[PDB]
Amino acid sequence: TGLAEDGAKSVYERLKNDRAPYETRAQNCAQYTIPSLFPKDSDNASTDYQTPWQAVGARGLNNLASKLMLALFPMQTWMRLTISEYEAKQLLSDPDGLAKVDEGLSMVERIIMNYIESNSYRVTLFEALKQLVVAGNVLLYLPEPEGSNYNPMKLYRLSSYVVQRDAFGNVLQMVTRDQIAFGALPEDIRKAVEGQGGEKKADETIDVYTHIYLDEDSGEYLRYEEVEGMEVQGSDGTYPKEACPYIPIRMVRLDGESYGRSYIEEYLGDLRSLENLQEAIVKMSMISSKVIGLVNPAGITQPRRLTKAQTGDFVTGRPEDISFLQLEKQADFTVAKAVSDAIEARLSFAFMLNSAVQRTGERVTAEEIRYVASELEDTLGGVYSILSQELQLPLVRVLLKQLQATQQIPELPKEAVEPTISTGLEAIGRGLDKLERCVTAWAALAPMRDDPDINLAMIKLRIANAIGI
Template sequence: FAAAQLQADKNDVDTRLSQVAETTAAMMDDLKVRPALAEVIKQLIAAGNVVAYLPQDRAPRVYRIDQFVLKRDNYGQFTDIIIQEKVWPSTLPEAVRTALGVKLDPNTDEKQIDVYTVVEQRDGKVTHWQEIEGKEVPGSKSDPIPTDQAGWLAPRWTVVPGSDYGRSHVTEYLGDLLSMDDNYKAITQFAAIASRVVTVVNPNSSLDVAELAAAESGDYIYGEPDTIQTLGLNKSQDFAVIKDVTATIEARVKEAFLVANYRDAERVTAEEIRSQSEELENGLGGTFSVLASELQQPIAARYLYVAAQRKLIPAIPEGIRPKIVTGLAALGRAAEVNRLRTFAADAIQILTPQVFASLVNAPAFLSRLGNEHGVSSLETLLKTEDQMAQEQQQAMAQQAMQAATPAIAEAAIGAATQDPNQGT
């Protein structure tokens, strides 16, 4: 009984946590978080570094590497970030312009001014403010906020020990990219030269070059065809080598940037795709770990905090923290769903459907499957234990009634046909 109660409590907790995740994800969609995160990934792949700010009521802000400088401590956590932005003075509130001494002259062209955002992390708390022309913008300084709730992120693609900045994915394959670019340039130039058609006529030929040039398709002219020749480069073999080398480099770059490159066949099995996916995942295993700690974990913590502040979800207890699972196993809820399906299919094949149905805990299995699918209002779809017990009692009563019906009918028939004088 205790084990069953614990399992029921676990299913209830899983359902509630699934509702929390679904509500938070819906709020993130309302705040347009996904487009900003896509830009963050692009910046990490190309530049290796990016800074993002996640406000509570607006879409995230993304800053390129040429817009900020930062410092990190020995553990890789940022300590100071300075961001430079350019704004038009006319877009600043009048109170801010007055306090900072920024004046607008209608007789001259407006020029942009620099706005610096300073972010400091000290003792596990983050503070930020803005400055214009060396003066702090009034009302811009925030109160100290715990790091996992502040919303400031400074992720890296690849960690470089002892460096404040990371290395990009493009940098790792810069040699291949440059070589491929040079080869494509040579092939394009060769194609441009080869596309020129120049005809050489033997000077001793009786052909008139002007007449030949003016001839249209289907015309007849006098001459000897052996005295005419079209110039060719005769470099096809040489450029075939460049083409093969370029194809090899291109395949390597495609694999590095996760571009699908399956074999050309009518049937490509799922096992082949899974095998190649595992190879790619192993090659980027370190990157996934870095992104989990510096991007995914802070994003989850930040928006769970924002959802709780908005009263969309209950406050998350101290003992519960989001866990980011990296690698192929973390491709989403679909991975867990596939594992459940594979488990059920294998068990049914080995044990037969009847034996599997008698051994599996059907309500718990369906609850787990629904949670992984992200089904909303799952508790309204599945029957409770009380409902199942009541239905079982009704079925037993109906079965007993059906079993007693023949005996009752036989007794009634016997009573009806019995001679009333019998026994007197």
């Protein structure tokens, strides 16, 4: 039936081999930065996950994830909706349309955020964010609200799914490979496994494959989940192109690449060098630690007598004879240390660790949000923009498709019932700045109100025009 083709498993393995290289570079990145975050396919519990010899990678990766999370999903607000595309008709002094908007959208603003708290999307998206900054891609799915019970977004790591794109980048088809134990499987898919046969112990691994793909007739997607080769009725449905329930997100896009590349990947080469050099200093020092008593046979020491002495006992011997193997590498040690420190500085400047200006006087909330913003863009990369387009705006996009539907639509009019989401700095805060500027300008207008030889009406009009009103 079209590009459903062989079935969910086979298309999964096909695209899987093509995805393999991104997976491998995600793996190496992991070993260099932080081992336990992205594991080896074969390994289960037994794996060692040796900490890398250097810790700059781990500390910086973690700090970068934090800063990105704080600047991207701040506590106070994270989005704005403004009335659009009918502006020329009513934005011109109808205070009601704007007031209903202030009300309807404020309802929307608060609710969406409130729903967010409950479902703990903060923690879930933070972990997905760290996963994406260490590796190529992350896929997050928002399931139906299900009333009071929370439905947390689930991050599926790059190793467990697949996405295909064209040279442009459109979402052609994606296949997830989640494994859910027999018992945990929903009663419905459980019924599906049961009909094929297989009454099972709670333990059996049942694999669910979601195969969202493109329709050759309609510009829609056609989801369906299956166990093995047999399709099961997982609510086959036509989700709109603009909002896709699953959200594949790439760290740094490229032309003609159906996947993402981690940001740390760009700095992997310097990082690896640090590891090597550091390894040598740690190792070099340990060799020095061994104390290997060196004696000159020609001499009269005869170490037996020396070992025998209890403290403060005068055995025969000579000072010159007993000596200790030291390590003479001193120039080497200095060169290594200096080069390593410079490399550490570089890695650090990029990782927004050791930037050295904003740290003084840290105080969360407030408006720390504005400053930490640009600096992230300045040196991490403009990556804030890339993620912002991909995560912040879409995450809201799907929430709006669902939340508005399950609750009540306010009295807000019909031109904004399909509102246009805006995120980022334009959306950070709400504007009060223009107002405080203008009333400070008016406060500087203390001297005279019966000010002769001047026009009161117009000067106050000009002060008003200085800031948008």
